[PDB]
Amino acid sequence: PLLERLKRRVVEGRKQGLEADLEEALKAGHKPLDLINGPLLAGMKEVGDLFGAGKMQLPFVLQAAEVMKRAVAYLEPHMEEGKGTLVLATVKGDVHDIGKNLVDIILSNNGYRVVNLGIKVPIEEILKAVEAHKPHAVGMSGLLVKSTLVMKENLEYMRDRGYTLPVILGGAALTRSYVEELRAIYPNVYYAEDAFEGLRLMEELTGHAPPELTRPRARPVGEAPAVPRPPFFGVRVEEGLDLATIAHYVNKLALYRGQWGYSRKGLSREAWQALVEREAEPVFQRLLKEAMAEGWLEPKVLYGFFPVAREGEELLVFSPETGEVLERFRFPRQKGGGLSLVDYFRPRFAAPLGDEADWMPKEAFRAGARDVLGVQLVTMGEAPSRKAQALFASGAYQDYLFVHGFSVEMTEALAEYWHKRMRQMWGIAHQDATEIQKLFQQGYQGARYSFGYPACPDLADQAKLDRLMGFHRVGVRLTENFQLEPEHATSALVVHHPEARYFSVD
Amino acid sequence: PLLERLKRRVVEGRKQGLEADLEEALKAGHKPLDLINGPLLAGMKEVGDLFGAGKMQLPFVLQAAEVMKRAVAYLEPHMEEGKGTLVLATVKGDVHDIGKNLVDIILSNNGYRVVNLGIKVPIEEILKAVEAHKPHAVGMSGLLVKSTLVMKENLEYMRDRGYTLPVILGGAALTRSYVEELRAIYPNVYYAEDAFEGLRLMEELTGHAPPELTRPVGEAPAVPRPPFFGVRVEEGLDLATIAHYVNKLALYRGQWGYSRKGLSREAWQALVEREAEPVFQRLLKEAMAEGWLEPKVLYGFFPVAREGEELLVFSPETGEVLERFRFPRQKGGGLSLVDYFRPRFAAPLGDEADWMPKEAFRAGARDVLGVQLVTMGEAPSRKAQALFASGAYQDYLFVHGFSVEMTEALAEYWHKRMRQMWGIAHQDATEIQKLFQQGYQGARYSFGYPACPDLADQAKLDRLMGFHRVGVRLTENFQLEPEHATSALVVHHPEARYFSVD
Amino acid sequence: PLLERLKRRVVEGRKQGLEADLEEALKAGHKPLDLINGPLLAGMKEVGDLFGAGKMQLPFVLQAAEVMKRAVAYLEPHEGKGTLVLATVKGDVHDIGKNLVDIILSNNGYRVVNLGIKVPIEEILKAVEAHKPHAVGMSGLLVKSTLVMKENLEYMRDRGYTLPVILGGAALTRSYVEELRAIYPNVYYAEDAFEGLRLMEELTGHAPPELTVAPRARPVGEAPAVPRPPFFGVRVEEGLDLATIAHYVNKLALYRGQWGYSRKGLSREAWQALVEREAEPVFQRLLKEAMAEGWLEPKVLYGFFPVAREGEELLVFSPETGEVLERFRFPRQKGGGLSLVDYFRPRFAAPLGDEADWMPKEAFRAGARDVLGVQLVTMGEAPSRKAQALFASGAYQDYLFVHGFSVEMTEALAEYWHKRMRQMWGIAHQDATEIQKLFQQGYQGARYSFGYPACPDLADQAKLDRLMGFHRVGVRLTENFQLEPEHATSALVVHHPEARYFSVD
């Protein structure tokens, strides 16, 4: 009756009057340990089952996790180990902790001890924690292909040093079949698609569940009608940036679905329209207002234009002062010799289309530059990472998810806004829509390409952009895996060519 | 009884019901002259004695001076001169009148006639006022060393033309011993440290007392890339943002003259919260609404290089050497400002050949120097002069000091902005109390500081930047007009710091 | 003899008959190169050794250099020891020291690239990259030129040069160049051309490394009057008599100082012989030739201004408006002795006699109580043009003679015009009857030229240029404030009867 109420309080996620009910339980015969192991955990189990069915959204799971967190905190003085220990780390060179920290929340509030070592953790630091704590498994996380090769190298090191403990790998670029191939290196390695697979693996490994998981041709790219003149050549900084203006360019469906994990599949269209207006849209307004007042988004842009030319399959970047070739980008071509990014750039020493010899930088034009490439790096600073880490540490799990996702999509909004500003500076903006819904058709002249996209997939090519721009100027650095630190930061090549578009290689 | 009340009204500084008491005094046998010379002056004397003891703050002295000002103004119709006449001037090329105008307030409200000629007054204009008014003394004021050499030249001129009347000198750079040496030129010359020494001298000279009183840098890890090369303007800055960067202890103690000497730490904490902090909030709010602070910035970055003991500034268009700064060295060949700059034609640290302006790099530029000039416009000078003219002496001191420290706050704020633009801000403090002194990469050196004391070097900065673009000019003594204005060199080098030559 | 005769012909310095002897040497076995490297150079080396001893005068060294010059010129129709880039520094007009280094090094076998006068460091180093020399040679007279040499070394070290730099100059000492090795390690001092030869021989690899109660002046009282000038302002005088100017030459300054005839290595009988035989005939020849051909062009810019002392400054007032145009600050002797300002009446001081009657009205009302004479004299660009023609054609002895003559005739013109200023001013009446007595300073007042101890700052010539307009007699100031052309000098002319020459130290 009371125990059913405490079990309901987890599932529905009802904070207010929890401490009154727990106080009544202990004086009516029940022990603090039996409340945690009995009704509070039983609710947390059914939260995970409802997520497996597709009946419960991810923000309500973290609201359920918060009730368990508060329930244990109030029961800590009165009590007078857990199911098992997990060492958990994002791999060397990798800055992304959202996937990992969701694994920390679900496993901790399902009873397991979780040692979270943080981001950019070398294998030596990981295995020092293995010997200190003596866990039932290690958990390794990483976003992109370079991080997956660090995971491989960590397994090579682990097999060589003589470890045989279970290793759980999670990652976007990582697939199930690739982890099966890594069992050539390290036999006791397992793939986890999400946190709840990580929970199943740990239950199977520790001995609380039976072993099942642990068992045509493209149209020709012509000449552009002109090469447009930029306002300047070089790279410049913009800092005075209005967050209310930036907020207008957010992909709200990418925020609400992609980052926060509200869903239309397990609900009706009436309940979707309700869920956005009731829950999601008020959080957006709250975070925007709070971010303006407190100042935990710090919008900055490093932007510029360089004289360029195609030579062969390479794009050459020339110095606007000296005309010396600073960098060479080689982009991949589609199979059967289709489209490449270099097809949008004019050949070196080619006959000018109009009056580009009047305004192209003198030495770069004499060295053969016949085109211009826009470059932008945008960031919201280290401040949103600092704010999210404070919310995580204090145990506000729902607000951690909300602030992380908001910070991701506000950085993308700043990239969208600045791309529009680059087009206006360019003189290619006059075919844009004034309103933002039409920009999600890609309704403008040219395109924006981030490194890691299909048409320019090598994240190493960010290093060339850093040498050209100087990422330090807006507080941004590259890791050993060429990811941007802090994570709320994204760079792009900006292409004027009217035929330019997104395309894949396969 | 009534005369004790009028004497109390000066000392405590009680305005309301003064006019009623003075009306009662004249119909009870007392003449208007004897009220001024008797009880009203007796209060003003004891105000000065309490200041000598360290028992009374400077704002309350000016509140006491206001009571005398109103008392004389109401007694002007009932009369149809004074203890003596003073001609008073800030010297040619000099813009600073706070020291002078405090001498005007104390001497005027101690009975003396004061002819205030204003700022930038040549000796010919001073001596025309001497012949018109026939004073007991001349008063000459000036801030820095170039102004003291104008004072010397004025004394040479005066001795040669055959004047022998007393000359009172005041100034920051002026010392007691230097004025004693100027008696080789002009025997009747006297030093005044403050207004009350000026009062003692005038009392002695006019015949109430006997005549004389007197008295190892390594390489930087990189050269950072600036946002641009050249100069830009920023206008319409947020005064509420600027207000956060004020040195409040420099305002409250340094400019306004509240003190912890003579009081307890309980009464200090009271005095700040009760009196000082409400004046700050009142002046800030009023300055925003009325618009008597006009925050403007002229700022820029230039390609530079060290050759010997000179810093060369190169054109970002042509690469021609525009200006050469020679900075002083510490005694026994210690630190100089040039030690923070890379040598001309020196081997690049990283990629500076790629982005440094082409001709300046070919002419040998290997480094970048930030420059800023900040101002609050002529508007605060105009506002202070209106408060002075109408007789609100306490509000004159408050608005002057506020205007000085808000200009310095704007310099502090913009230095932070220069660091953010330059890419060197990521070691800055989250709080503003840490920003005073170091707490950031590099340093800001204003002309007239110990590390670069020659005010002539501002002329080179004016030719580079164009000070006229934000309403600022240089005088014959190279001071910035209007006075609520300061320029600095901004140095990126992480080992940069404040130092003296001596 | 064979080849001892050609070696003798350089040393004793007999030009005419050389081509016959050189023709006889070839076809008796000897090659043209071996004659130059063997006996002709051997004589040129012993000429320099005799000059080091003090046994041979400098005119005979250049006569010996001429024999080598003609010997090589005749052997030109049918490389050397090393290359030298040679320049007088930016702002400096004096090339006699440099051009003597050019004569001795060229006739000792070395290639000399003479860049000329007022050469910036960028122009010097363009010649370094073109010719690829074994050393650079930098020349300059006065202290401002030595600071340009310092700045050139700073620039050179910074741009990454390490090739030997030889400095020569009057203001330069040996210890100062040792201190410049803090800036540029491979820098060397050369006292004369023969030290420059030794350095170059060592650098090029033809010699081993060795080089590589104070008495107090009387108080200045008031003058008996301020004399009235002919006018206030500035005027030009041209077409002066060179025969008249010739009378005022310091012959001992010409013969010893400029031409380099000497005693000490000779007796007093041989001195009296050497003046009468060699020196005095050259003076008469150059004077007569200068009159006929016209390669001295004597010109004067001269004037008088209302002045007054204020403090340690002399103020110059406008004779039209009475505005203070310029302020001159002169140095004082140690222990507060004499200064040039002590000869000028104080500003606003009580008139001595009738000066209020004739002093310009506004300048007197602004406080002018005294008058300052100013003169700038020149012999034109013509003597520089004449000397350069003698140098180019290879008449090295006549180059030295015409240079020295031109220097001392300009000083003579300054002496003559000072006398004329005294006559115009009304202070000439008690002048010296003879010119020997004029060297004892037997006249009223004194003449102070810029660079002398009483007014040493050459910057103060700029004030005089703004007043007078130096362009009126073809004269300009350089960035080092030297007068271009070099045969030109300015002076302040002081009426005061107690005025005299004094040093500061």
PDB file of C-alpha atoms in Angstrom, chain B residues 343-441:
ATOM      1  CA  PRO B 343      63.493  41.481 -33.022  1.00  0.00           C
ATOM      2  CA  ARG B 344      63.258  42.853 -36.604  1.00  0.00           C
ATOM      3  CA  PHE B 345      63.820  40.120 -39.270  1.00  0.00           C
ATOM      4  CA  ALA B 346      63.926  37.422 -36.476  1.00  0.00           C
ATOM      5  CA  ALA B 347      63.117  33.785 -37.316  1.00  0.00           C
ATOM      6  CA  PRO B 348      59.264  33.230 -37.095  1.00  0.00           C
ATOM      7  CA  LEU B 349      57.947  31.273 -34.068  1.00  0.00           C
ATOM      8  CA  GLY B 350      55.210  29.511 -36.125  1.00  0.00           C
ATOM      9  CA  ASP B 351      53.062  30.597 -39.110  1.00  0.00           C
ATOM     10  CA  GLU B 352      53.274  34.443 -38.953  1.00  0.00           C
ATOM     11  CA  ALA B 353      54.616  34.759 -42.562  1.00  0.00           C
ATOM     12  CA  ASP B 354      51.232  33.361 -43.751  1.00  0.00           C
ATOM     13  CA  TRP B 355      49.061  36.110 -42.082  1.00  0.00           C
ATOM     14  CA  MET B 356      51.337  39.113 -41.152  1.00  0.00           C
ATOM     15  CA  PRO B 357      50.787  41.975 -43.734  1.00  0.00           C
ATOM     16  CA  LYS B 358      52.987  41.274 -46.747  1.00  0.00           C
ATOM     17  CA  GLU B 359      55.110  44.423 -47.075  1.00  0.00           C
ATOM     18  CA  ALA B 360      55.478  44.955 -43.271  1.00  0.00           C
ATOM     19  CA  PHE B 361      56.710  41.333 -42.911  1.00  0.00           C
ATOM     20  CA  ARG B 362      59.142  41.851 -45.863  1.00  0.00           C
ATOM     21  CA  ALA B 363      60.340  45.112 -44.177  1.00  0.00           C
ATOM     22  CA  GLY B 364      60.956  42.966 -41.020  1.00  0.00           C
ATOM     23  CA  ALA B 365      57.780  43.081 -38.816  1.00  0.00           C
ATOM     24  CA  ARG B 366      57.652  40.008 -36.498  1.00  0.00           C
ATOM     25  CA  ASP B 367      55.130  41.052 -33.782  1.00  0.00           C
ATOM     26  CA  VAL B 368      51.773  42.782 -33.135  1.00  0.00           C
ATOM     27  CA  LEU B 369      50.957  45.703 -30.762  1.00  0.00           C
ATOM     28  CA  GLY B 370      47.414  46.531 -29.615  1.00  0.00           C
ATOM     29  CA  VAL B 371      46.504  50.233 -29.130  1.00  0.00           C
ATOM     30  CA  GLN B 372      43.419  51.728 -27.393  1.00  0.00           C
ATOM     31  CA  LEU B 373      42.173  55.264 -26.655  1.00  0.00           C
ATOM     32  CA  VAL B 374      39.031  55.496 -24.472  1.00  0.00           C
ATOM     33  CA  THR B 375      36.964  58.559 -23.495  1.00  0.00           C
ATOM     34  CA  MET B 376      33.654  59.533 -21.845  1.00  0.00           C
ATOM     35  CA  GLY B 377      33.431  62.649 -24.132  1.00  0.00           C
ATOM     36  CA  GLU B 378      33.332  66.371 -23.249  1.00  0.00           C
ATOM     37  CA  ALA B 379      29.859  65.870 -21.592  1.00  0.00           C
ATOM     38  CA  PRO B 380      31.206  65.004 -18.020  1.00  0.00           C
ATOM     39  CA  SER B 381      33.492  68.095 -18.065  1.00  0.00           C
ATOM     40  CA  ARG B 382      30.428  70.175 -19.131  1.00  0.00           C
ATOM     41  CA  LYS B 383      28.293  68.622 -16.327  1.00  0.00           C
ATOM     42  CA  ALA B 384      30.951  69.170 -13.589  1.00  0.00           C
ATOM     43  CA  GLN B 385      31.466  72.827 -14.676  1.00  0.00           C
ATOM     44  CA  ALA B 386      27.666  73.459 -14.384  1.00  0.00           C
ATOM     45  CA  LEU B 387      27.669  72.001 -10.814  1.00  0.00           C
ATOM     46  CA  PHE B 388      30.730  74.157  -9.915  1.00  0.00           C
ATOM     47  CA  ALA B 389      29.250  77.395 -11.422  1.00  0.00           C
ATOM     48  CA  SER B 390      25.860  77.025  -9.653  1.00  0.00           C
ATOM     49  CA  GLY B 391      27.657  76.398  -6.277  1.00  0.00           C
ATOM     50  CA  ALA B 392      26.877  72.659  -5.691  1.00  0.00           C
ATOM     51  CA  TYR B 393      30.448  71.938  -4.526  1.00  0.00           C
ATOM     52  CA  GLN B 394      29.860  68.431  -3.049  1.00  0.00           C
ATOM     53  CA  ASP B 395      28.192  67.255  -6.313  1.00  0.00           C
ATOM     54  CA  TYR B 396      31.140  68.757  -8.311  1.00  0.00           C
ATOM     55  CA  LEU B 397      33.609  66.524  -6.382  1.00  0.00           C
ATOM     56  CA  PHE B 398      31.312  63.472  -6.715  1.00  0.00           C
ATOM     57  CA  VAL B 399      30.708  63.856 -10.502  1.00  0.00           C
ATOM     58  CA  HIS B 400      34.425  64.593 -11.232  1.00  0.00           C
ATOM     59  CA  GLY B 401      35.648  61.505  -9.312  1.00  0.00           C
ATOM     60  CA  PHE B 402      32.913  59.284 -10.816  1.00  0.00           C
ATOM     61  CA  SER B 403      33.868  60.513 -14.337  1.00  0.00           C
ATOM     62  CA  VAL B 404      37.597  59.773 -13.676  1.00  0.00           C
ATOM     63  CA  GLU B 405      36.990  56.207 -12.367  1.00  0.00           C
ATOM     64  CA  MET B 406      34.347  55.347 -15.030  1.00  0.00           C
ATOM     65  CA  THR B 407      36.938  56.304 -17.745  1.00  0.00           C
ATOM     66  CA  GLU B 408      39.515  54.028 -16.038  1.00  0.00           C
ATOM     67  CA  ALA B 409      36.760  51.341 -15.777  1.00  0.00           C
ATOM     68  CA  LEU B 410      36.149  51.706 -19.568  1.00  0.00           C
ATOM     69  CA  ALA B 411      39.942  51.242 -20.099  1.00  0.00           C
ATOM     70  CA  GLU B 412      39.846  48.091 -17.888  1.00  0.00           C
ATOM     71  CA  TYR B 413      36.726  46.713 -19.689  1.00  0.00           C
ATOM     72  CA  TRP B 414      38.132  47.406 -23.183  1.00  0.00           C
ATOM     73  CA  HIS B 415      41.499  45.791 -22.276  1.00  0.00           C
ATOM     74  CA  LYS B 416      39.451  42.611 -21.531  1.00  0.00           C
ATOM     75  CA  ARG B 417      37.701  43.036 -24.927  1.00  0.00           C
ATOM     76  CA  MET B 418      41.097  43.470 -26.693  1.00  0.00           C
ATOM     77  CA  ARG B 419      42.272  40.190 -25.052  1.00  0.00           C
ATOM     78  CA  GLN B 420      39.090  38.355 -26.239  1.00  0.00           C
ATOM     79  CA  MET B 421      39.489  39.693 -29.809  1.00  0.00           C
ATOM     80  CA  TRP B 422      43.243  38.867 -29.810  1.00  0.00           C
ATOM     81  CA  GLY B 423      42.689  35.243 -28.588  1.00  0.00           C
ATOM     82  CA  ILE B 424      44.562  35.682 -25.241  1.00  0.00           C
ATOM     83  CA  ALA B 425      41.513  35.975 -22.868  1.00  0.00           C
ATOM     84  CA  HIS B 426      41.174  32.249 -21.939  1.00  0.00           C
ATOM     85  CA  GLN B 427      43.387  32.681 -18.779  1.00  0.00           C
ATOM     86  CA  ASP B 428      41.190  35.624 -17.477  1.00  0.00           C
ATOM     87  CA  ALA B 429      39.379  35.640 -14.109  1.00  0.00           C
ATOM     88  CA  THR B 430      35.598  35.052 -13.825  1.00  0.00           C
ATOM     89  CA  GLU B 431      35.453  37.883 -11.171  1.00  0.00           C
ATOM     90  CA  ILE B 432      36.417  41.566 -11.589  1.00  0.00           C
ATOM     91  CA  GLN B 433      38.416  42.117  -8.319  1.00  0.00           C
ATOM     92  CA  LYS B 434      41.110  39.742  -9.748  1.00  0.00           C
ATOM     93  CA  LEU B 435      41.360  41.854 -12.995  1.00  0.00           C
ATOM     94  CA  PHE B 436      42.989  44.770 -11.015  1.00  0.00           C
ATOM     95  CA  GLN B 437      46.833  44.281 -11.367  1.00  0.00           C
ATOM     96  CA  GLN B 438      47.527  40.987 -13.368  1.00  0.00           C
ATOM     97  CA  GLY B 439      45.036  38.030 -13.550  1.00  0.00           C
ATOM     98  CA  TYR B 440      45.311  37.980 -17.393  1.00  0.00           C
ATOM     99  CA  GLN B 441      47.775  37.464 -20.265  1.00  0.00           C
TER     100      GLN B 441
END
